[PDB]
């Protein structure tokens, strides 16, 4: 089964070029990865449309990033709001 | 036995499902298969779950159904899951009890 290298990208066969797959592959996996829920303490988030992350556990929906539940930009804003508290 | 449509419509759309039926006369006859609906649900924002005491009556027959066929005899009975009611009965009580304390 397992690909030596390209995983989810294996479906694309020998096309689209190596780099673009390499770069699609990161976003592709975080996109289908289950991302950690602060609410449940559970890996549980899964995306259901770009920027939408349903929680498999407690019904819920974080907004979040496209291919990832949290943007690096967002890491700043949340604490920065915490510090203003 | 090959069958053909009997209602004036002739497309294999979802609302026109048909049931093949051997008859007492030994005909094989398509019959309209009812457009079953899923029944009452708790609201979509509350996870959208099928309610327990309620039947999936088509509104075509929902008018003729007994009232309790579409509900339970509990507050929010045809609307909310029992947990969802209890979520409120708690949330009503506990939230007011904190407000009653914020006067002190």
């Amino acid at each position: 089964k397992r690909t030596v290298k390209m995983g989810v990208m294996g479906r694309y066969g020998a096309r689209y070029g190596a780099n673009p797959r390499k770069r699609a592959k990161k976003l592709e996996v975080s996109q289908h990865a289950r991302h950690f829920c602060s609410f449940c303490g559970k890996f549980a988030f899964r995306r259901k449309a770009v920027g939408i992350w349903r929680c498999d556990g407690c019904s819920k929906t974080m907004a979040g990033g496209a291919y990832t539940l949290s943007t690096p930009n967002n890491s700043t804003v949340r604490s920065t709001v915490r510090r203003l508290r | 036995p090959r069958v053909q449509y009997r209602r004036r419509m002739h497309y294999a759309t979802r609302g026109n499902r048909m049931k093949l039926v051997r008859t007492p006369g030994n005909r094989l006859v398509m019959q309209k298969r009812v457009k079953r609906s899923q029944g009452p649900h708790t609201p979509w924002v509350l996870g959208h779950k099928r309610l327990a005491g309620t039947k999936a009556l088509r509104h075509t027959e929902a008018r003729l159904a007994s009232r309790h066929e579409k509900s339970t005899s509990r507050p929010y009975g045809g609307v909310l899951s029992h947990e969802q009611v209890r979520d409120r009965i708690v949330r009503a009580f506990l939230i007011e009890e904190q407000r009653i304390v914020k006067r002190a």
Binding site: S38, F39, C40, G41, C58 | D87, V90, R91, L94, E97, Q98
Partner: protein, 66 residues
């Protein structure tokens, strides 16, 4: 913390579905609550925890005996 030695020292119920019931009986000798608890769930143990005059420690776990 010290509640870990509690695990071997004595009894402990776990989870709100029965940590609340140790709390009605007042069998509860303490009640830990992880931060993760939703506020209306957590308030509910927080409210029994007042009626039982049980010790409360925001950190669900209840230690009936120890």
């Amino acid at each position: 913390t010290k509640i870990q030695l509690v695990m071997k020292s004595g009894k402990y119920v776990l989870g709100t579905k029965q940590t609340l019931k140790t709390l009605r009986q007042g069998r509860s000798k303490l009640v830990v609550i992880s931060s993760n608890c939703p506020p209306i769930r957590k308030a509910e143990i927080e409210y029994y925890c007042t009626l039982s005059k049980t010790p409360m420690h925001h950190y669900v776990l209840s230690i009936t005996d120890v």
